[PDB]
């Protein structure tokens, strides 16, 4: 079942591939094979290794041109402090005034951040329902609900200095709003002193949880 | 990695 091409996927192209670590890495597409129900894509990584991958586990090595939309399946730069990885997610918001022309990404592990146009890459063959390859069931469920409800996004209006409870790991914690950036809020957990950027429509934020529990 | 995800545990 060997192919030299599949539409715009051509043997020899540059590509990103998902490693068993779930991080993504640069490489070359060296083969295309039909195996049972679909195609598999053989990637030789630049640094080390080879993998045989489904089409939702490869991404183009170019940045999207208004091509992407809410629900788009992407690989993006996941920056948390001074650590950076390429990791899969979903486009939650496209560039606009309120967000200073950035993309909001909801990553497959539950992380959220804004990224620039030059920090994301379109997955080559996403699933029709783009969330159906998210492994973590809580994340998968959340994204299905979010994408389906879009553009109805209930959010809480929060101000710097405001004190609220924020959930983490099953506990509701005293916290403080440090900063607002578009649809994200930087929450300081007051017992720990760590910060987290959280979506203003997340029911981890007390005012958002309370609204939903009553509604 | 530190994330609490999108919804309460």
Author numbering:
A (entry chain A): 190 to 254, 256 to 405
B (entry chain B): 9 to 17
What does the paper say about this structure?
SETDB1 (also known as ESET or KMT1E) is a histone H3K9 methyltransferase that generates H3K9me3 in euchromatic regions. We show here that SETDB1 3TD binds to histone H3 tails containing K14 acetylation combined with K9 methylation. Crystal structures revealed that K14ac recognition occurs at the interface between Tudor domain 2 (TD2) and Tudor domain 3 (TD3).
We further solved the structures of the W358A mutant in complex with H3K9me3/K14ac or H3K9me2/K14ac peptides. The K9me3 was bound to an open aromatic cage in TD2 formed by Y268, W275, and Y277, where W275 was rearranged compared to the apo-structure to accept the trimethylated K9. We conclude that both TD2 and TD3 contribute to K9me binding, with TD2 showing preference for H3K9me3 and TD3 preferring H3K9me1/2.
